[PDB]
Design a protein around this ligand. Structure first.
Ligand SMILES: [Co+2]
Ligand SMILES: [Co+2]
Ligand SMILES: [K+]
Length: 282
């Protein structure tokens, strides 16, 4: 399998006009980055519903992952699942992004665009899906293997999953946010991988990326302490090779410079009075 290149984009999929759009749809930038980090009880309830629906759309599009299938076909399946549930696909028209999820194969770190690219035997495919319903977002991603994936590349996926699940388990009120990046990068570095630095987790509520940043590497200077009612993502991109990367002419797709493969998982988390709740479950 060699250096991916861009296929061709289908036209914008339509969203029935009854489904409420986030404010940024069709605008160049989003109104976000200065929202409260602690959600009201009502916003948290509504986020369990966004969360379950984006977890539905991810499993559904993930079941279609197979040698043969286009990434456009995954986007179609994700788009249709969100729409049939009354959810707007958060990515659609978000800063001009063209599709309803991001599909990121192999040396694509993140933000790959659904197109006519055909998944081949041995590929790894990340599907990243966000839902917007009742005023709030649910955000979640997983890397799926397609056919006979190399051991090297299976170990990578399962170890990225494992990093994310370790990170999540250490989420509790009163503990420092920098504990997440420490657990992740220590797990990663244990097997010689390299955690991506420029791309982060985020606060999420009534907005997509609300200004709260969640580093996936070890950075103790961050003073932020986790509080009950905090809602944020853990979404680590773990690289087999060098951290260096490039961006396609489409201005979205991020690829590793050395073309070595990379994997990611993501969940949307609630900090509770004593623990953690994962909102992006079925
Ligand atoms: Co995401
Ligand atoms: Co996210
Ligand atoms: K990838």
């Amino acid at each position: 399998r060699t250096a991916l290149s861009p296929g061709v984009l289908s036209p914008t999929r339509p969203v029935p006009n009854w489904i409420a759009r986030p404010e940024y749809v069709g605008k160049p930038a989003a109104q976000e980055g200065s929202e409260p980090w602690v959600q009201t009880p009502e916003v948290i309830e509504k986020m369990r519903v966004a969360g379950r629906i984006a977890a539905g759309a991810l499993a559904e599009a993930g079941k279609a992952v197979a040698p043969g299938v286009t990434t456009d076909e995954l986007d179609r399946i994700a788009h249709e699942y969100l729409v049939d549930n009354g959810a707007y696909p958060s990515t659609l028209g978000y800063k001009g992004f063209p599709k309803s999820c991001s599909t990121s194969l192999n040396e694509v770190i993140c933000h790959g665009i659904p197109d006519s690219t055909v998944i081949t035997d041995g590929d790894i495919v990340n599907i990243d899906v966000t839902a917007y319903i009742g005023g709030v977002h649910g955000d979640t991603n997983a890397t799926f293997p397609a056919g006979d994936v190399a051991d090297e590349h299976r170990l990578l996926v399962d170890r990225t999953r494992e990093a994310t699940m370790r990170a999540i388990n250490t989420v509790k009120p009163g503990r420092a946010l920098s504990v997440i990046g420490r657990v992740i990068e220590s797990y990663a570095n244990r097997f010689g991988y390299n955690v991506v630095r420029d791309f982060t987790g985020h606060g999420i509520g009534t907005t997509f990326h609300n200004g709260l940043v969640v580093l996936h590497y070890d950075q103790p200077a961050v003073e932020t302490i986790m509080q009950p009612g905090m809602t944020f993502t853990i979404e680590p991109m773990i690289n087999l090779g060098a951290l260096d990367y490039e961006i396609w002419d489409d201005g979205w797709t991020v690829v590793t410079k050395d073309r070595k493969w990379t994997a990611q998982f993501e969940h949307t988390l609630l900090v509770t009075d004593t623990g953690v709740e994962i909102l992006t479950c079925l």
